Amino acid sequence: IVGGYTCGANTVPYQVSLNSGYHFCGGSLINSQWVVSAAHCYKSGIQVRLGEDNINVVEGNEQFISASKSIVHPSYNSNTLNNDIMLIKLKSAASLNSRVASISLPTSCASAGTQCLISGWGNTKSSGTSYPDVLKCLKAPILSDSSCKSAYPGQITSNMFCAGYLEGGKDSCQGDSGGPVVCSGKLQGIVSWGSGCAQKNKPGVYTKVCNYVSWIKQTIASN
Ligand SMILES: NC1CCCCCC1
Ligand SMILES: [Ca+2]
């Protein structure tokens, strides 16, 4: 997260870190045994880490649970990043509490102008590289489809939205991939892609979660 703030320990209780020897992606806990992330975060040997703040220190509220299976969206295209969504099932159910909690799926799509919270352990520099070890947060508005399409001609599908600031300086970045965009207590987006981070006229692009609720519910119900 570039241009954000330190969230505060366990203030984003649905935020998970995906770990394969090291943090490589974010995710969102949507019930006691399922996590939503980006399809481009797919790999084998995933351990889900819940209750994290400093991802380099065991602080006492963590639960570490290996994934039993991952399900990438059947229509995911890794070239265009259309349908950039994946479900991860935990080998055992997380113990839910005030610091480890699921986030509700949307019942309706959020509109341009809606204020959202984007979070993660990604790069905090738009040119350099610096990884925070504590969770970072950014408040950002959803942008209009027209401005999103104008920023990225030929690349924005009906399964994507832009959020952030056309002026630059505030954005999600490398390592935030797969993480939450939460608006009014609902998971509306997944950190997906962009052209660099926090660059002028290149806002972050996010998977439009409201388009996938039926798929998520049906997949969970049979897996
Ligand atoms: N806003 C994006 C975050 C996902 C990874 C690519 C960098 C920029
Ligand atoms: Ca920790």
83 and 55 assigned to the same domain? yes
Distance from residue 52's CA to the centre of ligand 2 (Å)? 5
160 and 109 assigned to the same domain? yes
4 and 111 assigned to the same domain? yes
CATH of residue 206 = 2.40.10.10
Atom of ligand 1 nearest to the CA of 177: 4
68 and 135 assigned to the same domain? no
**Six-digit token string for 51:** 């209750």
Place of tokens 């897996």: 223
139 and 169 assigned to the same domain? yes
**Six-digit token string for 44:** 């084998």
The Cα angle at residue 52 between residues 47 and 55, in degrees rounded to 5: 75
33 and 75 assigned to the same domain? yes
Active-site annotation holder among 17, 23, 28, 40? 40
Helix, strand, coil percent content, the chain, rounded in steps of 5:
10, 35, 55
Distance from residue 61's CA to the centre of ligand 2 (Å)? 8
50 and 39 assigned to the same domain? yes
Burial of 194 (0-12, 13-18, 19+ CB in 10 A): buried
174 is in an annotated binding site: yes
Domain span including residue 66: 13-102+211-222
Instruction: Decide: helix, strand or coil at residue 31.
Output: strand
The Cα angle at residue 169 between residues 165 and 171, in degrees rounded to 5: 65
Active-site annotation holder among 17, 23, 53, 84? 84
Report resolution (Å) to 1 decimal: 1.7
Cα–Cα distance, 108 to 188 (Å, whole number): 9
Of 76, 57, 69, 70, nearest to 9 by C-alpha is 57
Of 141, 148, 79, nearest to 110 by C-alpha is 141
User: In the annotation, is 73 catalytic?
Assistant: no
Structural domain tally of the chain?
2
65 and 161 assigned to the same domain? no
* 180-183: strand order across its sheet: 5-6, 136-141, 115-120, 180-183, 186-193, 204-208, 160-163
205 and 152 assigned to the same domain? yes
DSSP states along 121-152: S----SSS----SS-EEEEEEBPPHHHHHHHS
Place of tokens 């006691």: 32
54 is in an annotated binding site: yes
205 and 120 assigned to the same domain? yes
Task: Catalogue the E-assigned strands of the chain.
Answer: 5-6, 15-19, 23-31, 34-37, 47-50, 63-72, 86-90, 115-120, 136-141, 160-163, 180-183, 186-193, 204-208
Cα–Cα distance, 206 to 215 (Å, whole number): 18
44 is in an annotated binding site: no
Give the number of the ligand closest to the Cα of residue 197. 1
Place of tokens 């969970």: 220
User: In the annotation, is 53 catalytic?
Assistant: no
DSSP annotation of 199 reads B
Residue nearest to atom 4 of ligand 1 (CA): 193
Give the number of the ligand closest to the Cα of residue 23. 2
Instruction: Decide: helix, strand or coil at residue 66.
Output: strand
109 and 204 assigned to the same domain? yes
The pocket around ligand 1, CB under 6 angstroms, is made up of: 171-174, 176-177, 191, 193-194, 197, 204
80-to-73, 146, 192, 193 alpha-carbon distances in Å: 14, 19, 11, 10
Contact 155, 195 (CB under 8 A): no
111 and 8 assigned to the same domain? yes
Contact 106, 212 (CB under 8 A): no
152-to-38, 72, 110, 162, 179 alpha-carbon distances in Å: 20, 25, 20, 10, 21
